[PDB]
Write an enzyme that holds these catalytic residues in place. Structure first.
Site, PDB file in Angstrom:
ATOM      1  N   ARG A   9       0.816  -1.208   0.000  1.00  0.00           N
ATOM      2  CA  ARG A   9       0.000   0.000   0.000  1.00  0.00           C
ATOM      3  C   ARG A   9       0.852   1.261   0.000  1.00  0.00           C
ATOM      4  NH1 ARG A   9      -2.041  -4.037  -0.805  1.00  0.00           N
ATOM      5  NH2 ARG A   9      -3.892  -4.966   0.165  1.00  0.00           N
ATOM      6  N   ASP A 450     -14.735  -6.081  14.532  1.00  0.00           N
ATOM      7  CA  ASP A 450     -14.119  -6.178  13.216  1.00  0.00           C
ATOM      8  C   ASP A 450     -14.147  -7.632  12.766  1.00  0.00           C
ATOM      9  OD1 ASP A 450     -12.697  -5.994  10.902  1.00  0.00           O
ATOM     10  OD2 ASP A 450     -10.866  -5.200  11.801  1.00  0.00           O
ATOM     11  N   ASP A 452     -12.523  -9.047  10.114  1.00  0.00           N
ATOM     12  CA  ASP A 452     -11.419  -9.433   9.250  1.00  0.00           C
ATOM     13  C   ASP A 452     -10.300 -10.090  10.051  1.00  0.00           C
ATOM     14  OD1 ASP A 452     -10.454  -9.717   6.693  1.00  0.00           O
ATOM     15  OD2 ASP A 452      -9.557  -7.720   6.583  1.00  0.00           O
ATOM     16  N   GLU A 455      -3.393  -9.888   7.800  1.00  0.00           N
ATOM     17  CA  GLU A 455      -2.639 -10.290   6.624  1.00  0.00           C
ATOM     18  C   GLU A 455      -1.261  -9.640   6.651  1.00  0.00           C
ATOM     19  OE1 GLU A 455      -4.898  -9.357   3.158  1.00  0.00           O
ATOM     20  OE2 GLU A 455      -6.394 -10.927   3.504  1.00  0.00           O
ATOM     21  N   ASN A 458      -0.958  -5.869   6.085  1.00  0.00           N
ATOM     22  CA  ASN A 458      -1.502  -5.022   7.138  1.00  0.00           C
ATOM     23  C   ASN A 458      -0.455  -4.609   8.161  1.00  0.00           C
ATOM     24  OD1 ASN A 458      -4.373  -7.196   7.062  1.00  0.00           O
ATOM     25  ND2 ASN A 458      -4.055  -5.286   5.931  1.00  0.00           N
ATOM     26  N   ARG A 461       1.305  -0.716   8.482  1.00  0.00           N
ATOM     27  CA  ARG A 461       0.762   0.478   9.115  1.00  0.00           C
ATOM     28  C   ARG A 461      -0.101   0.187  10.332  1.00  0.00           C
ATOM     29  NH1 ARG A 461      -2.373  -1.106   5.033  1.00  0.00           N
ATOM     30  NH2 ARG A 461      -4.633  -0.774   5.174  1.00  0.00           N
ATOM     31  N   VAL A 500     -20.731  -4.755  11.192  1.00  0.00           N
ATOM     32  CA  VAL A 500     -21.800  -3.833  11.558  1.00  0.00           C
ATOM     33  C   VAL A 500     -22.662  -3.581  10.329  1.00  0.00           C
ATOM     34  CG1 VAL A 500     -22.357  -1.536  12.398  1.00  0.00           C
ATOM     35  CG2 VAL A 500     -20.453  -2.797  13.390  1.00  0.00           C
ATOM     36  N   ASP A 524     -13.492   1.577   6.038  1.00  0.00           N
ATOM     37  CA  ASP A 524     -12.854   1.837   4.754  1.00  0.00           C
ATOM     38  C   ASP A 524     -13.852   1.909   3.604  1.00  0.00           C
ATOM     39  OD1 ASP A 524     -13.573  -0.784   4.754  1.00  0.00           O
ATOM     40  OD2 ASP A 524     -11.586  -1.598   4.308  1.00  0.00           O
ATOM     41  N   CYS A 580     -20.535   0.239 -23.926  1.00  0.00           N
ATOM     42  CA  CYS A 580     -20.068   0.211 -25.309  1.00  0.00           C
ATOM     43  C   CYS A 580     -18.560   0.404 -25.384  1.00  0.00           C
ATOM     44  CB  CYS A 580     -20.787   1.280 -26.134  1.00  0.00           C
ATOM     45  SG  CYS A 580     -21.322   2.738 -25.211  1.00  0.00           S
TER      46      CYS A 580
HETATM   47  P1  LIG Z   1      -8.328  -0.163   6.705  1.00  0.00           P
HETATM   48  O1  LIG Z   1      -8.735  -0.539   5.301  1.00  0.00           O
HETATM   49  O2  LIG Z   1      -6.849  -0.329   6.941  1.00  0.00           O
HETATM   50  O3  LIG Z   1      -9.117  -1.094   7.726  1.00  0.00           O
HETATM   51  C1  LIG Z   1     -10.533  -0.963   7.750  1.00  0.00           C
HETATM   52  C2  LIG Z   1     -11.087  -1.923   8.772  1.00  0.00           C
HETATM   53  O4  LIG Z   1     -12.527  -1.771   8.848  1.00  0.00           O
HETATM   54  C3  LIG Z   1     -13.115  -3.043   8.956  1.00  0.00           C
HETATM   55  N1  LIG Z   1     -14.485  -2.987   8.444  1.00  0.00           N
HETATM   56  C4  LIG Z   1     -14.849  -2.652   7.194  1.00  0.00           C
HETATM   57  N2  LIG Z   1     -16.196  -2.721   7.056  1.00  0.00           N
HETATM   58  C5  LIG Z   1     -16.707  -3.116   8.235  1.00  0.00           C
HETATM   59  C6  LIG Z   1     -18.052  -3.387   8.779  1.00  0.00           C
HETATM   60  N3  LIG Z   1     -19.152  -3.245   8.003  1.00  0.00           N
HETATM   61  N4  LIG Z   1     -18.144  -3.779  10.066  1.00  0.00           N
HETATM   62  C7  LIG Z   1     -17.061  -3.925  10.851  1.00  0.00           C
HETATM   63  N5  LIG Z   1     -15.813  -3.693  10.416  1.00  0.00           N
HETATM   64  C8  LIG Z   1     -15.573  -3.295   9.145  1.00  0.00           C
HETATM   65  C9  LIG Z   1     -12.206  -3.973   8.170  1.00  0.00           C
HETATM   66  O5  LIG Z   1     -12.396  -5.322   8.534  1.00  0.00           O
HETATM   67  C10 LIG Z   1     -10.819  -3.404   8.478  1.00  0.00           C
HETATM   68  O6  LIG Z   1     -10.281  -4.037   9.636  1.00  0.00           O
HETATM   69 MG   LIG Z   2      -9.480  -1.666   3.495  1.00  0.00          MG
HETATM   70 MG   LIG Z   3      -8.035  -7.464   5.212  1.00  0.00          MG
END
Ligand SMILES: *P(=O)(O)OC[C@H]1O[C@@H](n2cnc3c(N)ncnc32)[C@H](O)[C@@H]1O
Ligand SMILES: [Mg+2]
Ligand SMILES: [Mg+2]
Lengths: 985, 147, 76
Positions: A9, A450, A452, A455, A458, A461, A500, A524, A580
């Site tokens: 990134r 969260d 996710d 990785e 990640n 930062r 969420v 994000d 198109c």
């Molecule tokens: P950046 O892109 O470094 O990290 C963003 C984090 O936000 C979390 N995230 C995105 N969208 C959602 C929702 N809908 N609920 C809870 N957490 C969210 C990603 O998992 C990244 O950790």
């Molecule tokens: Mg992201």
């Molecule tokens: Mg990720």
């Protein structure tokens, strides 16, 4: 040799040459307190060659107010010694060292020198050396709610990139004899006066195609001028222009010369008289420290303030400063001298780390030269701030109590916050909360969610995560890390792995939300931001929004009954190309990359999904025959992927890949050129293949070519993955198999009843019965950019470059293809630090419960150009309903679970309004134009019963309210807007 | 979104579109079905064409997804019903109503644009052999648009 | 009266206006010179965000004043 698996990134922000030069630079950092440790952390994450620390001062307890690598077991140990161990883990490519003794001549080993917590005489001594030896010098200072930065990169600094933007390019329609260049229809060049451009593919004026940059004289949004092109030709047609960015020479002054006549950078234009005040005030602080054995003024002490103001008068007289000193502001600087706030440290550390990167890479425009900042609007007013409440208590929060007091500390320790997201901004926010002491009291709590997992990319930062943590949940790791930082947070952080959204309202319900104090978004994407904003509006909770992109960032605050919400404003939308253009007439590599992604989906994802759904749903064919746009396509996909072209080995996958190459890069182009020959003309006599339309040419397969072989390899590998076969990478098998291939003849077709249904039936019954295929499934391909062994980006790059070769477009590489196809957002650690600092500076305003809207600030910044700007939030619009003042955002009606007729009668009798439309969610519960029978059936039902009946979905047991939208008309027939309805079940 | 969608629906009720008729499917406001009548001075004369309209969650800040359901033989409409209309891809603004989109689609039907086509074969037939295009369009509108 | 607008990306724009112009006219001029719809423009002068319906003199914007054109970002 840059590790793109870690710096993915950051390379999209800086580049490869910039990081290559950055990895050869040494950085010395003097001072290891919160500001110094923040700078060192950001530099280690950035990827400089090495970092050296110099701080022989033994640790004190108050130092823990913003130093998160210090524990209470380290008291009495030099700060650098206890910090180097924890700094050495952030990045494995950056060694971190410590020097017990600093000499002047030793400074020649470093590319940049950062100075914090140092007196002015020592700073002058260091800068007198670094200036004449051409070493970049940065000096930073953080005093309470005040901050200062000074940069001196030498008398002959060379800046290659000034604004950090990509070079501008565009297609030309015509160039007259006097250099008047005109763009295509409704296309903007975007240039500014004085820019340089170079032309290519200009017909009629070959001279412009040599490649010499030329000055630009902008004459309008669609045309510009380059001078006189009389000699080169009379008129030029078509072609493209590309901007050329030229280096600039920036000359800095030494600190000794810059003290007398400073050059200011203004973070806010609302207060342009202050930086001259801060210039005197910080020098007076240095003089006071020198006159008291290095001791700063005591918190909220009037004697020390008087002496400090005498020093300020003396300095202002000596420097011949023609500025009238503001006594209140200067004495405020005196009062908060011993303050050490983690938010100010984060903000200034991000800024200073970006300056260090500018020094070591010669990219982006540096600060020139003094940057004085204050956040004095954050000082609480609902508590007592005096000498008695601000005196130290011998705890780790002394640096914050010296600014805010003990009562405000008690207020902070009782917060019940909710953090959505645990990425970079989330990690920074959690660290700031841990340092500030948030939710360490008996009634405090932190909730972080969260969905996710960690990785490799990640770790660049998100400093709370280590390589051993890859594969774990972000929220659990973040909570554990911050519980390590502040042990008082043990048992006061709850981590969820829930997204969420509408599907998580059973967990983050009414009971969860009614106990919170504020919500902080660290997301994000915009969909989640809007959802959380609506939830905060319904529950009337404060919201803190923040976002970053590369070196740019913004922060916004939403306050109930005071400001507008996050969703009250619009942002520019994502750009999507016409179908198109994508299908037939591409002219940019982005078009071909989008086409390649669609090809990937259509080859390896959709047919597999159709095959799998056919073998699962017993009534799939019958439904699809009448509920699909192209049932014939579905039947053909099923037949081809089950019986006709099922591979029994990898060689059949190779042959299939060769056939697909012919189909998508040789035959469709021949058909297109049959429909629109290269000599064809439009309806007005103009050539068809001119300007945005580029004439394609079929590709003939050549095994020796690199792109053709790459496409064959990736396509065969992905097909084998779909069918679960064993792929190979040795070119020998590919060359052996493809040698014996006889392409079927192809001739483009010129074209020229109800039995097709019978043909579809015959195709359907020819398929093997689902009963014969039980337990047999095909593996679909789910796009994954971050893995470099699944052949996804390889296939997309090969297809994109081949289609670019079809239309004579300049091909890209895997790096840019991954950037475009993956929709990657460039990210930086410095921007994250800055936004976290600003958000935590607004958080203390929220905690104090400030009522006026001029006390809050939304912030925007771009670190590439050194721009900071702040503005008051927009107040929520008001309205008149039944001669009463109503907030359009934060007001609602609270009604019981009455009937529809009773609701209408209530609105008629109470508000004097006639209800015309009533909707809930995505359903139309009531409309004035519905037939009388339907209404007479729907009137005597309760709202919950009506919603259940219309949606055919019973309300869940945890559902405690309904939100209804209502459109009503007044007696005169004028449409009047009203707030939403909150039905209590 | 609900407020503006109901405003548009009521306005359609308040003014007979004559040549068109759009309305929600069942009770869902984010899924409309619209009808368009083939212009008299067109090969599609006396034809009824059904379109499906899908409003996004971000309406009116993102364009509605409009797709033909009836098969039509047009240079700018492919076999999936996708319509080559600029106000639906990148020229959409939160100031256009569904009635404007339907008028745009009717204008597209009354005269195609073969110079920037979506179906190159139909565009080629239109440019070179006009009479064959007329016959094919008439056959398609008699076979699919009438029933 | 002549004013300057600086974007968050570093670009500079010069507008010829009058003290009696509304914010809507200025936003229309910025759209003409940049193509940014008025509803997506965030203008800041002296720490105040300019709102539609008011005039320049309401914000004491005079000749050679500098405005900032900003926008929100979606990373995090
Ligand atoms: P950046 O892109 O470094 O990290 C963003 C984090 O936000 C979390 N995230 C995105 N969208 C959602 C929702 N809908 N609920 C809870 N957490 C969210 C990603 O998992 C990244 O950790
Ligand atoms: Mg992201
Ligand atoms: Mg990720």
């Amino acid at each position: 040799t840059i590790d793109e698996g870690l710096y993915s990134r950051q390379l999209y922000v800086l580049g490869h040459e910039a990081m290559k030069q950055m990895s050869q630079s040494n950085v010395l950092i003097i001072g290891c307190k919160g500001l110094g440790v923040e700078i060192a952390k950001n530099v280690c994450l950035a990827g400089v060659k090495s970092v050296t620390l110099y701080d022989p001062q033994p640790t004190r307890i108050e130092d823990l107010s913003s130093q998160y690598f210090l524990t209470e077991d380290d008291i009495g140990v030099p700060r650098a010694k206890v910090t180097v161990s924890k700094l050495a883990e952030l990045n494995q490519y950056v060694p971190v060292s410590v020097v017990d003794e600093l000499s002047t001549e030793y400074l020649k080993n470093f590319k940049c020198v950062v100075v914090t917590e140092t007196s002015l005489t020592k700073q002058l001594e260091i800068n007198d050396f670094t200036h004449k030896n051409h070493i970049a010098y940065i000096a930073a200072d953080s005093r309470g709610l005040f901050g200062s930065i000074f940069c001196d990169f030498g008398e002959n600094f060379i800046c290659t990139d000034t604004d950090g933007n990509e070079p501008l390019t565009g297609m030309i329609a015509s160039i007259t004899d006097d250099g008047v260049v005109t763009m295509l229809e409704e296309t903007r060049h975007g240039l500014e006066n004085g820019d340089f451009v170079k032309f290519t593919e200009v017909k009629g004026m070959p001279g412009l195609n040599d490649g010499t940059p030329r000055k630009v004289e902008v004459k309008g949004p669609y045309t510009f001028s380059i001078g006189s092109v009389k000699d080169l030709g009379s008129a030029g047609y078509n072609g493209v222009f590309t901007q050329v960015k030229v280096p600039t020479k920036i000359s800095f002054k030494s600190l000794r010369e810059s003290l007398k006549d400073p050059e200011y950078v203004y973070p806010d234009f609302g207060k342009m008289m202050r930086p001259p005040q801060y210039h005197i005030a910080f020098q007076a602080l240095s003089a006071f420290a020198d006159a008291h054995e290095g001791s700063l003024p005591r918190p909220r002490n009037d004697i020390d303030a008087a002496e400090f103001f005498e020093f300020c008068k003396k300095i202002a007289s000596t420097l011949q400063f023609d500025v009238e000193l503001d006594e209140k502001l200067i004495k405020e600087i005196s009062y908060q001298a011993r303050g050490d706030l983690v938010a100010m440290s984060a903000f200034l550390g991000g800024a200073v780390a970006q300056e260090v990167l500018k020094a070591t890479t010669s990219k982006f425009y540096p600060l020139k030269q003094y940057f004085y900042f204050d956040s004095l609007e954050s000082l609480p007013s609902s508590v007592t701030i005096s000498e008695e409440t601000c005196k130290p208590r011998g705890c780790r929060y002394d640096g914050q109590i010296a600014v805010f007091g003990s009562e405000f500390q008690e207020k902070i320790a009782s917060l019940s916050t909710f953090l959505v997201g645990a990425g970079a901004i989330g990690c920074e926010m959690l660290k700031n909360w841990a340092m500030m002491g948030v939710a360490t009291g008996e009634s405090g709590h932190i909730s972080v969610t969260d969905m996710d997992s960690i990785e490799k990319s990640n770790l660049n930062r998100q400093f709370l995560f280590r390589p051993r943590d890859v594969g774990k949940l972000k929220s659990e790791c973040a909570s554990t890390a911050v519980s390590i930082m502040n042990p008082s947070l043990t048992g006061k952080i709850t981590s969820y792995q829930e997204r969420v959204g509408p599907e998580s309202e059973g967990i983050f319900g009414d009971e969860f939300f009614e106990k919170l104090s504020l919500v902080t978004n660290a997301l994000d994407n915009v969909e989640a931001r809007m959802y959380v904003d609506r939830r905060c509006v319904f529950f009337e909770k404060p919201l803190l929004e923040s976002g970053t992109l590369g070196t740019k960032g913004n922060t916004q605050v939403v306050v109930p009954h005071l400001t507008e919400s996050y969703g009250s404003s619009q942002d520019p939308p994502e750009k999507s190309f016409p179908i198109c253009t994508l299908k037939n007439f591409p002219n940019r590599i982005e078009h071909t990359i989008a086409w390649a992604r669609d090809l990937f989906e259509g080859l390896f994802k959709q047919p597999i999904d159709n095959v799998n759904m056919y073998l699962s749903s017993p009534n799939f064919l019958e439904t699809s025959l009448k509920t699909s746009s192209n049932p014939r396509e579905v039947l053909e996909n099923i037949r081809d992927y089950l019986v006709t072209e099922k591979p029994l080995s990898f060689e059949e996958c190779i042959m299939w890949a060769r056939l697909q190459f012919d189909k998508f890069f040789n035959n469709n182009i021949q058909q297109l050129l049959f429909n629109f020959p290269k000599d064809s003309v439009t309806s007005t006599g103009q050539p068809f293949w001119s300007g945005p339309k580029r004439a394609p040419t079929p590709l003939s397969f050549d095994i020796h070519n690199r792109e053709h072989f790459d496409f064959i390899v990736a396509a065969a590998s992905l097909y084998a993955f779909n069918y679960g076969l064993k792929s190979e990478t040795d070119p020998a098998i590919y060359e052996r198999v493809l040698a014996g291939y006889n392409p079927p003849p192809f001739a483009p077709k010129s074209g020229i009843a109800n039995k097709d249904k019978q043909e579809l039936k015959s195709i359907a019954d020819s398929l093997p019965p689902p009963s014969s295929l039980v337990g047999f499934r095909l593996t679909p391909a789910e796009f994954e950019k971050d893995d470099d062994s699944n052949h996804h980006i390889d296939f997309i790059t090969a297809a994109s470059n081949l289609r670019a070769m079809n239309y004579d477009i300049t091909p890209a590489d895997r790096f840019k293809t991954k950037f475009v196809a993956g929709k990657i957002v460039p990210a930086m650690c410095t921007s994250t630090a800055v936004v976290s600092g600003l958000v935590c500076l607004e958080l203390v305003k929220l905690v104090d419960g400030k009522k006026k809207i001029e006390e809050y600030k939304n912030g925007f910044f771009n670190l590439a150009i050194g721009l900071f700007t702040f503005s008051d939030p927009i107040a929520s619009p008001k309205m008149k309903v039944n001669g009463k003042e109503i907030d359009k955002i934060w007001d609602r009606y609270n009604l019981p679970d009455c009937t529809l007729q009773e609701l209408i009668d209530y609105f008629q009798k109470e508000e004097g309004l006639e209800v015309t439309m009533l909707s809930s969610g995505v359903s139309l519960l009531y409309a004035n134009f519905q037939p009388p029978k339907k209404l007479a059936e729907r009137l005597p039902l309760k709202i919950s019963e009506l919603v259940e009946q219309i949606t055919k979905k019973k309300l869940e047991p945890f559902r405690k309210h309904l939100v209804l939208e209502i459109c009503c008309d007044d007696a005169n027939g004028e449409d009047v807007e009203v707030p939403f309805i909150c039905i209590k079940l | 979104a609900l407020k503006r969608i109901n405003r548009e629906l009521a306005d359609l009720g308040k003014d007979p579109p004559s040549s068109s008729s759009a309305g929600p499917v069942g009770d869902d406001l984010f899924h409309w079905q619209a009808t368009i009548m083939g212009p008299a001075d067109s090969p599609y004369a006396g034809g009824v064409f059904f379109l499906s309209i899908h409003f996004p969650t971000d309406y009116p800040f993102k364009p509605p997804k409009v797709n033909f359901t009836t098969r039509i033989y047009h240079p700018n409409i492919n076999s999936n019903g996708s319509i080559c209309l600029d106000i639906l891809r990148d020229q959409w603004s939160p100031a256009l109503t569904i009635s404007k989109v339907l008028l745009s689609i009717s204008s597209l039907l009354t005269d195609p644009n073969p110079d920037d086509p979506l179906v190159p074969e139909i565009a080629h037939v239109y440019k070179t052999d006009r009479s064959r295009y007329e016959l094919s369009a008439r056959e398609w509108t008699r076979k699919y648009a009438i029933g | 009266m002549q004013i300057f607008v600086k974007t968050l990306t570093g670009k500079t724009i010069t507008l010829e206006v009058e003290s009696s112009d509304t914010i809507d006219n200025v936003k229309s001029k910025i759209q003409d010179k940049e193509g940014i719809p008025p509803d997506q423009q965030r203008l800041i002068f002296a720490g105040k965000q300019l709102e539609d319906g008011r005039t320049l003199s309401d914000y004491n914007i005079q000749k050679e004043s500098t405005l900032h054109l900003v926008l929100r970002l979606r990373g995090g």
